[PDB]
Amino acid sequence: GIAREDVVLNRILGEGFFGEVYEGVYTNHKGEKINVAVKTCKKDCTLDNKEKFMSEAVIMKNLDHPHIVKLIGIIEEEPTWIIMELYPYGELGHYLERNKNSLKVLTLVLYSLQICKAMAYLESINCVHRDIAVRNILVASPECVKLGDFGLSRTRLPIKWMSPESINFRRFTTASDVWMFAVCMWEILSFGKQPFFWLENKDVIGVLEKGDRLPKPDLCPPVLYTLMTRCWDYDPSDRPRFTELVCSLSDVYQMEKDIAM
Ligand SMILES: O=C1C=c2cc(Nc3ncc(C(F)(F)F)c(NCc4ccccc4S(=O)(=O)N4CCCC4)n3)ccc2=N1
């Protein structure tokens, strides 16, 4: 752990569910200047909120993975402070509306690839993620995205993104995660398009019932779109597991650095 002396703050990043994240600068217990993002808690509901914050906190100490947000340290006290590496490019949703053109599917599928690997690790430490959405993903480098942290676990509800069970029974298992994740894959190969932008929440479930799926994305293959289609199998048990999506997505992409001359 590290102390308030060590963190200079320099601007408000944005307003989380827990309010302010601030850009600032850590400075090493040995000398060095790491640029940083510092999550704090609102002006915050008695317990319900501080709890959910400590809880995200504590899961974070344990995490470790090239494609989840890096946790540098915590300061327990009043404003408790979660310190995370800064990712100077921001939400992938936006790095994406503003690059419709620069990006080659071979890229759009490395992103989805890497998130998926992030999910496979989360599965194995039995964590789930409830916000695998493109606003909740950071770009570290054009060649590298990092999942959220926030949604990390185990109101405002990304219904548009939720498997039917997740909705009917508020069960988020790993299988409903797989559904969700495919909805994020859709997003990425749709350059940041809102899933179901046309419906509002109330009549989503209906849709998926008569059997209705999200449009194939233009830049997205046949195989790949079928691989997403299985992830939206109404029946949880036909959905591919994470390790399955890794081994197989890492196909559709080494088969992609191929179609590249
Ligand atoms: O314009 C910008 C430049 C940014 C750089 C960012 N770099 C960055 N590095 C690490 C994190 C971490 F680890 F805290 F999750 C981080 N978090 C802030 C954040 C992450 C995801 C989504 C949103 C945000 S946020 O910036 O908190 N935000 C909420 C309301 C709109 C903006 N940001 C983030 C957002 C930015 N917006």
Which residue ranges make up each domain of the chain? Answer: 1-86, 87-257
Report the sign of the C-alpha dihedral through residues 256, 241, 56, 29, in that order.
negative
Whole-number Å distance, alpha carbon 36 to ligand 1 midpoint, is 11
Query: Using a 6 Å cutoff on CB, does residue 13 contact ligand 1?
Result: yes
Helix 174-188, helix 242-249: angle, nearest 10: 30
Rounded-to-integer distance, Cα 138 and Cα 145, Å = 6
Under CATH, which architecture does the 1-86 domain have?
2-Layer Sandwich (3.30)
In contact, 140 and 89? CB cutoff 8 Å: yes
CB 138 within 8 A of CB 69: yes
Beta carbon of 146 within 6 Å of any ligand 1 atom: no
Most informative mutation of 17, 18, 21 for ligand 1 (most atoms within 8 A of CB): 21
The continuous run of DSSP H or E covering 212 comes out as none
**Residue among 6, 44, 48, 131 flagged as catalytic:** 131
Burial 88-106 (b: 16+ CB within 10 A, else e): eeebbbebbeeeeeebebe
Is the minimum distance from the CB of 193 to ligand 1 under 6 angstroms?
no
143 is in an annotated binding site: no
d(CA 131, CA 158): 8
PDB experimental method: X-ray
Taking the CA atoms of 21, 27, 30 and 32 in sequence, report the sign of the dihedral they define: positive
Separation of 144 CA from ligand 1 center, angstroms?
15
CATH number of 87-257: 1.10.510.10
Give SS3 for 94.
Answer: helix
What distance in angstroms lies between residue 87's CA and the mean position of ligand 1's atoms?
8
